[PDB]
Amino acid sequence: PNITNLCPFDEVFNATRFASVYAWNRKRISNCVADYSVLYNLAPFFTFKCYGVSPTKLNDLCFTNVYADSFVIRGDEVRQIAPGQTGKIADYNYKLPDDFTGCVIAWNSNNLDSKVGGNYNYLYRLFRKSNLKPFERDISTEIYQAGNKPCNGVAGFNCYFPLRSYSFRPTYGVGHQPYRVVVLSFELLHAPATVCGPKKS
Amino acid sequence: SVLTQPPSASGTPGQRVTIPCSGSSSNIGNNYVYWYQQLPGTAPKLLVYGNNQRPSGVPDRFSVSKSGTSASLAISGLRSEDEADYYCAAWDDGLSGSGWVFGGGTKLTVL
Amino acid sequence: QVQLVQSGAEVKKPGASLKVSCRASGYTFTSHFIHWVRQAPGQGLEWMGIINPSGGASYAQNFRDRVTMTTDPSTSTVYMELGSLRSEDTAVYYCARAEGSSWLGWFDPWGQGTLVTVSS
């Protein structure tokens, strides 16, 4: 009757490498007890932004399904992860619906992500024909054209590559620091419980 | 120079003297604090790193403590061989930029 | 046998460019970063940049846009050049080694020091 076990939060939060913005990886958590106390240790002076659950009383609540989304974005752009925002990274790479019942965690990570030589391994899309529906992922790298002439796999004027590259460096101001973001989504009171913290009889 | 130090300090031999380095959350709150000593006419050297340990070839006479958002270097058993400036260093991340902010440098005198 | 050797310099003129080299020996050169610092006479200390022994570099905001410094793993020498000097930039310049990881340094070796004077 008791789910016991342990939720793999340490694997999600402390993974060696996180995905890029346009190819954010989704992970599912189930059949374990969630201890939302190690969370406060990571980014302790940084604030959890939760959107429908009080972060203090989150321990005593059972969730039907928990999904974790991880990526790496620039500093000042983190404010775009909130629901209802508009911008380049909130409309061309990753958008949240305006019904989001979850909580987002962000912390400056300019100790292992960025390098003095410059980190070009993180990419982001810049050009799209139209908007993207909430919680969508596109990896296709077909060349996007805005003029009249068709693009037969070419570059230059009036024909651009949709993927641009972040250029992270140590001695940059807050805003150009690589921020690692993990957002947790879970809905309430609509299905049998699968994951939650301590509970007795 | 976000780091704040007293420009001058003095003490009699055998007296415990404390040199403070008071910073903020960005520079002293998150990262380590390192204490270097510069004699006149010589390049700076290393005295204390990591708030606990010291390099080889350095006596255990100097002691370091860190509290809140500030640090202190106490020199128990002061002698005549401590006529040098003392600098505190800590990586600082700010809205404008980021780097190794240093201190003004305290000129320590022995009577 | 760890040291960071430099070369002396003489007076300059405003608007000119000055170049100094830091050479290492006795240890694996392509393993440790390099830090640059400047000390104005009768003043404190302030560092300039961090460098891979073979690669790029990063510079502080204050001393950006006018410093250029490359790598040369042939004689284990790293050169730095400052352009558009001014009479307030008269100082002593030091090069220091660092821990292989950096980002939390312990500047144990330091350079001899180059005196730079800018007067007309």
Boundaries of every domain in chain C: 3-118
CA–centroid distance for A113 within its chain: 16
How many CA atoms within 13 Å lie on the side-chain side of A78? 26
A40 phi and psi, to 5 degrees? -65, -30
A19 and A91 inside one domain = yes
Are residues C120 and C15 in contact, defined by beta-carbon separation less than 8 angstroms? no
Query: Got the DSSP string for C54-107?
Result: SS-EEE-STT-SSEEEE--TTTTEEEEEE-S--GGG-EEEEEEE--SS-SS---
Inter-chain contact A173–B96, Cβ cutoff 8 Å?
yes
Taking the Cβ of residue B95 and every Cβ of chain A, the question of whether any pair is shorter than 8 Å is answered with yes
CA–centroid distance for B88 within its chain: 4
A7 and A23 inside one domain = yes
Taking the Cβ of residue C113 and every Cβ of chain B, the question of whether any pair is shorter than 8 Å is answered with yes
Compute the distance between CA of residue C58 and CA of residue C55 in angstroms, rounded to an integer: 11
DSSP 8-class letter at A39: H
Compute the distance between CA of residue A55 and CA of residue A49 in angstroms, rounded to an integer: 8
Bridge-based pairing state of the strands A66-73 and A179-185? antiparallel
A46 and A134 inside one domain = no
Q: Considering only CA atoms, which of B63, B30, C74, B90 is closest in space to residue A45?
A: B30
Compute the distance between CA of residue C58 and CA of residue C56 in angstroms, rounded to an integer: 7
CA–centroid distance for B102 within its chain: 10
The owner of tokens 């070369």 is C7
Q: How many domains does chain B have?
A: 1
Question: Number of helices (H) and strands (E), helices first, in chain B?
Answer: 0, 9
* Shortest CA distance from A109: residue in chain B: B93
| C5: its two tokens | 């050797």
Residue numbers of the domain that contains B105: 8-110
Beta strands in A39-167 (DSSP E): 49-50, 66-73, 102-108, 123-125, 144-145, 159-160, 163-165
Are residues A47 and A155 in contact, defined by beta-carbon separation less than 8 angstroms? no
Contacts 24+ apart (CB under 8 A), A78-81: A78/A106, A78/A179, A78/A181, A81/A106, A81/A181, A81/A183
The owner of tokens 């090069």 is C95
- The structure was resolved experimentally with cryo-EM
**Cβ-based contacts of B101 with chain A (< 8 Å):** none
Structurally, at CATH architecture level, domain C3-118 sits in Sandwich (2.60)
Query: Residue B85 is part of a domain; what is its CATH number?
Result: 2.60.40.10
* Shortest CA distance from B30: residue in chain C: C104
Compute the distance between CA of residue A135 and CA of residue A96 in angstroms, rounded to an integer: 6
CA–centroid distance for B76 within its chain: 14
Compute the distance between CA of residue A183 and CA of residue A175 in angstroms, rounded to an integer: 19
Return the exposure string of A173-186: e unless at least 16 CB atoms fall within 10 Å of the residue's CB, then b. Answer: ebebbbbbbbbbbb
| Alpha carbon of A180: minimum distance to chain B alpha carbons (Å) | 16
A95 and A5 inside one domain = yes
| A152: its two tokens | 């037969």
